[PDB]
Amino acid sequence: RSLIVTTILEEPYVLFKKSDKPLYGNDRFEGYCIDLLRELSTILGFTYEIRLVEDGKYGAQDDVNGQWNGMVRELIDHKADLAVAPLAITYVREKVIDFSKPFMTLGISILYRKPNGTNPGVFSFLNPLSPDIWMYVLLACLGVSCVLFVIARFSPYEWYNPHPCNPDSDVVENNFTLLNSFWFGVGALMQQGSELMPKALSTRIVGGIWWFFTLIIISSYTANLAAFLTVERMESPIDSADDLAKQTKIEYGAVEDGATMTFFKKSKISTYDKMWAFMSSRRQSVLVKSNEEGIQRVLTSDYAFLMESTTIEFVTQRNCNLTQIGGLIDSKGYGVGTPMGSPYRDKITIAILQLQEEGKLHMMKEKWWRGNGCPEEESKEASALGVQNIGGIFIVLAAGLVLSVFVAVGEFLYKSKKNAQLEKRSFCSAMVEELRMSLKCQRR
Template identity: 45%
Template sequence: MIFDGMEILTTALLELNEFDTLSIDCHSNDDAWQYGTTIINFIRQVATEGITGWVGFDESGFRANLTFDIVTMTENDFEQIGYWKNGIVHKTERWYHHLPSQEKMPLIRVTTVLNDPFVMNSKSSKELHGNDRYEGFVVDMMKEIGKFLNVRFEINLVKDGTYGALINSTTNEWNGMIGEVLRGEADIAVADLTINSNRELAVDFTYPFMSTGISIIYKKPTTKETSLWSFLSPFSTVVWICLLAAIVSISLIFFYVGRFTPYEWCDPHPCKHHEPVLENQCNMRNSFWCIIGSLMQQGSDVAPKLVSIHSFIHSVINISFHSFLPRAMSTRIISAIWYFFTLIIVSSYTANLAAFLTVEKVPFPFENVEQLAQQTKIKYGCLKNGATHKFFANSKIPLYRKMAEFMEQHPEVLMTSNAMGRERVEKQNGKYAFFMESATIEYITERYCNLTQVGGLLDSKGYGVATRKGAKIRASLSEVILKLQETGVLQQLKDRWWKQKGGGQCVAASTPLTELGLKNLGGVFVVLVVGALAALIFGICEFLIKTRISTNNSTTYPQDLCEEFKFVMSCQKSTKLLKRRSMKSLSQTPAATVGSGGITIPSGNNDQQRPQLLMMSNNMNDPNQPLSPTPTTTTVPTMIIDGSFEQNNHIANGVLGIN
C-alpha cells in the first residue's frame, strides 16, 4: 500500500506540468505552497492498477472499490477462503471447509428482558447487529453454554418487556417471556427469571444458575445517632452487672479476709506500751475505697484517722494521706488478682470506647420486614406482576398478606421495572422502600453508595432457563449449568459483571461495632473468682495457725478459735486489745538485764519473782567515765504480744529510751 501511494503521488506530480518552487519557513504561516490543493485534486483523479489492486478514490477522498482477500494458514501456505469488498464479506466454498461455521450449528432463539447486569444494551459508536447489540451476565453465560453444546443462540428482547404472568387461567394465556416460549416465538427464556410453582405449571426450568431471595433496598440515613449514655456502649448490660457485682463481692471478701488474718492487726503506736491496742485498717470503708480506687486507676490512699482538732487542721493544710497497703499474704493475693482484673477491664473499655466514639453509628428506622410493616411513615412496594409481587399475594403468612393488601390499596407503590424502584428509593429520601431480589440489590449497592440492603432474605429461590414442556434441550442445559458452577465459571462471570465492570465504587463498610460481652471477657472474671478463692484459703489458714500459736495456758485452742471467729464475724470494731499471756507464763519469762556486756536474760524458776528488766547506770552514756561494773536494775512489766518479736522489741526500745 505504501508503494501504491508513492506511485499515485508521482503520477499526480507529473501531470502537474508547471509550478514554481517556493522557500517555506517552518516557523511561519505566512507563506504556503499554492499548489497543495491542486495536487490533492490530481490525486483524486488518478485511477490505476497497483500492487494492492485497483486504486481509485471517491468524492470524499476515500479509496473506492477496495478489495481484501481473506486467507487462512494451512500446513504449507496461505489459502484464500473469501474476500472483503465495500464492507461485505464474500465467502467461498473453501471458507466452510477450513473454518467451523456457526451457520452449520443449530439455532436456538432466546427471549430476554433488559435488566442490569443480566442483559444490557452494548455501548458502541458503531451500529451493532445480532447478539452484539447486548452484553451482560446472561449473554456471556449463553456463549459458554454454546461452546459446550456446539449451538448458536439468537438473542431478542421480549416485546412487552415483562417476565411472565398468567393472564387467563382458562386458556392458560401468559404474557412476557413465558408467553413467547409457550407460543413458539422463542425456544428458551433466559434472564433473572425466578423459578416458582406457577411458572412450573406452564414451562420447564433448568437447574438454577444463580441463587437469590427477596430483600429490601433502602436509602442510607445521613443523620448521626447521639446518646447521653454512649459511654456505656463498650460493654454489654450483662458485663456491667457482673462488674458491679465483682466490685461489691471483692470488697466484702477483702474486708473479711483482712479481719480473719492476724497479720492485718497491728499496733498503730508501738512506742506507747501503756495503750495495748491493735488496729485493723481493712474496715468496710477502706475496703470499698481500695477496690474502687484501683479500678479507677487512682490508687488507694486514705485519709488518716483524725483524733483531734489539731490533727484535722494539720491534715487539711498539708493534705496528708497514707497508703492503704495490704500486709498479709492473703490480702496481697486478692489485691494482685484485682489489679490484673482492673488492667484487662480498663484496657478493653478504653479501646472499645475510642472505637465507638470515632465510628459513626447511623440509625435505621427499621431493621427487618416486621418493623417495616408495623410503621406507617415509610411506604414500600415491588415490581408489578413479578415474582416478588406474587410472593406477597400468595403467602399464607399474615404479615406478608397484610403487606400485599397495603400494596393493592396503594397501587402507586408498584413499579414496572427495578430501575424505577431504585430511582424512587433515591428520590423519596427515606420515605420509600423497595422489595427486589438480593442479587440485583448486590449489583446496585456496588454502584450506588447511598443505597443499602436492610434485613435478611424473606425466601430462598433461584434463576433458571425456561423451556417448553418436554423440550430435549432442557436436560442438556441443566448439565452444562452444573459444569459451569462446579468449574467456577459462573462465579467468575458474576464477579466480572457485579464487581469489576463498574462495581467497587463504594468503600466497603466497616464491621459494625459490637459491645463486649461475657464471651469476650468471661475469662478475666474466672481468674478473679479463682484468685478470690485462693485469698480466702490463705486467710483462713493464717487465722487458724496464728490462733493456735497465741493460745494461753488458761484456755484451749477451740475456745480461742471460737472467740476470735465471733469477733471477726461481728464486723463491729476495727480495734481490739492486745492479748496477754497468763501470769504463770509471765512468771516463767526471764528478766532482761543490761550489763557491761549488753542485755542478758537470766533464768529463774521462782513463780513469785517479778520479772526484772535491768538497765545500765546513767554514766553509761558518758564517754568520759568508765562503765560501772554494778548494773542498775529497773523493774518494768514484760509483755509478749502474740508471740511477735518485732512488737516486743518496739516496746522494749520505748521503755529503754532507745530511739
C-alpha cells in the same frame, strides 16, 4: 436450526453494548446472561440468536382470561426457544414451562437508603453539658472569684505578714488580689489546684464550696461524655420484614408482573399477607414498572423497594448510599427457561453444572458485578478517637497560645511605659529591657 433466545433488559444481566457502529445481530448485547449463553453455546454446540421479549414483561398470570404475559408467554406459544434471562423459579411458572437447574441463587429483600452518619465535629467535647450551663460555670468562676476577693480584703485573718524571719513591726500582706482570686477559681475548676490556699475560715468556705462545685461539674462531665464518645450508630427504623409491615410512613412496593409481588399475593403467613394487604390498596402508587424505577424512587423519595438479592448486589456496589435492609425473605433461583417438554431442559441442566464445578459461574459473576470499591460499614466496634472527634481542644490550645503572647506584649508595654516615666525614654527603654531578656544568664 439456530435457536431463538428470548430475554429482557435488566442490569447487569442483559444490557445494550456501548459502541458507535451499526450493531448487527447478536452484537449489541452484553452482560452476564449472554456471557452465560456464550458459554452454553460452546458446550452444547448450537447457534443462539438473541431476540427480545415483545411486551416488556417478565411473566405473570393476568387471571382475567387466565393467560400469561412476558417471556413465559413467549415460551408457551413456542415463539422463542430459550429464556436466558433473570427469569426466576416459582411454583406458578414451573407448571407451564420447564426450567433448568439454577445458575444463581436469589432472595427477596429490601433496597433502602443508608442514613447519613453525621460526624461528631471537632467541638464534640462541649456536648455533655448544655450551652447555658457552660455559661453558668463561667459566671460562677467569674462570680466566686470575685466573692473571694471581697471577703479576703474584708476578713482580718487573711492579713498575714509573709516574712519568715522576725517581722518586728509590720509587713502584713493580703496575697489575694484580683489576679490571684481568679487563679484560685480557675485552678480549682481544672482540678489542678493553685499554689494559693485560703487561711481565714471566712475564705475556707468559699474554697470549700467551690471545690465541691467543681467536683460535681467535672464528675458529671466525665460520666456523660462516656455516652457521647460511644456514638450510638445509625438505626434507620426498619430492620426486618416484621418491622417494615407495620409503618405506613414509608412507601413499599414491588415491580408489577413480577415474582416479588406474586409471592405476597399468594402467601398466607401473617407478616407477608399484611404487606400485600398494604400493597393491594395503592396498587398503582407503589408498584413500579421496572427495577430501574424501583431503584430511582428509593433514591429520591421515602420508598423501600422489595426486590431480589442478586440485583441488590449490583446496586449497592454502585450506589454507596443504598443498602440491603433486612435479611433474605425466601430463596429462589434463575433458571434458563425452556418450553413444556423440551429436549434442551436436560442438556442445559448438564451444562450449568459443568460450568459450576470449574468455577465459570463464579468468574462471570465477579466480572459483571465488579464491586468497584464502596465504604463497607463503620464496622460497629470500639471507636478509638481520631482527630475528627477530639480535634478542637488543639484549636483552643492553638488559639490560647495566640491570645497569650499578645498579653505578653501587653505586659511588656505596660511595664515599658511605667518605668520610662522617670528612668529613660519611651522607645529605647523597651530595647533596654530587650537586652535584659535576651541575656542567657541569671542576673539582677
